[PDB]
């Protein structure tokens with residue numbers, strides 16, 4: 318019935334056009350509060366974010382899912398502020414990414430489950446703001462720790478009905494191992510979105526997951542270091558496949574009958590301390606549309622390639638609504 | 647002239663008996679805020695801490711230096727609250743330990759220097775509380791990143807006059823490489839304390855460093871898992887050397903004429919999330935005296951072994967004052 322946002326619960330119908338994998342800021346736990354000047358200032362950053370969100374809003378975006386976990390330096394107070402100023406719904410996450418500190422690395426599956434439930438049921442920190450999704454990550458073969466995270470995510474999910482979204486090394490088929498883990502915990506594929514999937518040209522890997530019930534996240538659309546190879550760092554991060562190629566995978570899946578299984582996003586951000594210094598400069602150069610990239614460039618592009626408008630609407634309105642709706646077994 | 651505490655600046659005379667390496671809590675950045683229940687509750691942790699500090703105060707302790715860095719999950723507001731409540735001065739730290747997140751790992755020596763200076767000159771977070779010491783660490787041969795940390799700690803020390811205290815793997819003779827880098831930076835040894843030095847029986851290593859003008863940190867006196875060989879975990883952490891063995895190193899150094907270079911502490915804490923679950927329990931059992939261990943147990947012991955009281959007062963009062971006083975080259 319309802320989805321938890323940083324401003325409270327909204328009904329399914331209020332979500333509207335939703336971007337399923339984004340970030341206000343990409344950082345580290347405690348970083349933004351200890352070194353705000355790294356981003357110029359906290360004020361500078363929030364302003365940037367608001368402007369960005371207002372632009373996406375103007376394009377039709379009504380809601381975003383900020384998948385920043387505790388180790389991504391998620392700051393729920395920053396999220397609540399910009400959500401209110403931009404008037405954009407923001408769904409917060411719980412979960413763990415790949416940079417956990419010792420206090421986390423040393424926990425058991427049982428403890429991690431506990432923490433995930435806390436974030437979801439009780440709320441984040443002392444705010445009362447409840448997470449609406451669980452984020453997990455692997456990057457090639459899962460580490461023993463990661464496996465734990467995966468199980469914990471599954472259990473928390475099984476208890477709450479809240480979906481799970483993942484970060485993968487697409488080219489390594491991480492999705493496959495993740496699914497194996499989730500299934501072993503009894504998790505239903507329809508509550509899982511395997512992300513960064515557009516990062517591979519292997520349609521057969523994607524179609525096999527789709528077939529099993531999983532949701533496929535085509536969220537690195539605008540990531541391309543095309544014409545920037547003069548920059549190793551940018552190249553390494555964004556890759557060299559064009560945005561059109563990535564977009565085409567969306568059509569490719571539609572064509573195979575998996576439209577109900579597709580979720581699309583930008584995986585964008587307004588600040589990024591967890592990478593090389595000044596990386597944002599490069600990014601804002603690569604995609605000046607920011608999070609408005611999807612509605613502004615991708616929707617028209619697919620339309621133009623023959624995708625029916627109704628179909629696009631299902632993908633950006635319907636799929637997300639279903640995904641996000643907390644659903645128990 | 648004055649030393650920075652979490653309650654403000656105090657005069658050197660005001661510091662009295664000082665504990666140079668301690669912690670209110672051993673954790674991770676953001677952890678305390680995110681999962682306070684891991685310590686029962688923030689209030690519980692705070693109460694435990696006040697009691698513990700009141701007892702040390704009762705034994706003569708006027709000031710403690712909490713060497714918890716950003717990566718240790720230092721919570722200055724927490725430090726401030728128990729400091730006020732227990733009526734004990736607390737000196738806060740800047741620097742980095744060995745669990746830095748990606749947002750730090752990726753910084754340059756120049757950016758790191760700036761962060762350090764920030765904490766010292768402007769304040770920690772937004773509290774206006776200024777760090778009174780710089781904490782760095784190695785765990786055997788320094789890593790590239792650790793080398794950077796050491797240079798930055800050096801540089802910030804040079805500009806502000808604040809001392810540097812370190813975490814070593816004494817067994818490995820880390821002190822030697824530490825000194826090497828500091829010296830390569832023009833840093834006076836007299837502004838450095840090589841910690842956890844009681845962790846080794848190598849008097850050759852010790853006297854060398856002392857001979858050189860470095861301060862020797864004998865802060866693991868109470869760490870011993872004797873009678874706990876049953877516990878792999880506590881054994882690993884604590885060692886199997888008795889407290890007496892460690893305590894005697896203090897006598898040895900005095901004996902060689904190095905009384906003015908010794909600094910003693912307990913390296914105690916009231917909370918510890920960065921280790922196995924329930925470890926505190928084990929610790930409380932091993933040393934019920936907590937931070938009062940030194941005055942209650944070590945002082946009299948050394949007395950009984952022949953050390954002049956007057957000498958013991960130099961070690962606990964004079965040495966620290968001198969080390970802590972901001973001193974420029």
Ligand SMILES: CCOP(=O)(Cc1ccc(C)cc1)OCC
Nearest residue numbers: 340343389554584585591592600
């Ligand atoms: C915050 C998570 O970052 P990520 O997993 C993915 C990521 C890469 C590039 C851009 C523009 C956004 C997000 O990679 C950082 C090393």
Ligand SMILES: CCOP(=O)(Cc1ccc(C)cc1)OCC
Nearest residue numbers: 431432434435436438439440683
């Ligand atoms: C944070 C401590 O709360 P708790 O133990 C139980 C708890 C859940 C929900 C609400 C509204 C209050 C308390 O967390 C759930 C795992």
Ligand SMILES: CCOP(=O)(Cc1ccc(C)cc1)OCC
Nearest residue numbers: 672673718883913914920921929
């Ligand atoms: C927080 C710093 O702890 P440390 O560096 C060393 C340490 C060990 C034991 C005790 C009682 C205190 C401190 O522990 C590594 C996990």
Ligand SMILES: CCOP(=O)(Cc1ccc(C)cc1)OCC
Nearest residue numbers: 354760761763764765767768769
């Ligand atoms: C905004 C953070 O302050 P700043 O850039 C300069 C600064 C230092 C000290 C005081 C009292 C005010 C301002 O930090 C120094 C490294």
Ligand SMILES: [Zn+2]
Nearest residue numbers: 483484485513
């Ligand atoms: Zn990701």
Ligand SMILES: [Zn+2]
Nearest residue numbers: 339340384584
């Ligand atoms: Zn992401």
Ligand SMILES: [Zn+2]
Nearest residue numbers: 812813814842
């Ligand atoms: Zn240490």
Ligand SMILES: [Zn+2]
Nearest residue numbers: 667669713913
């Ligand atoms: Zn310590």
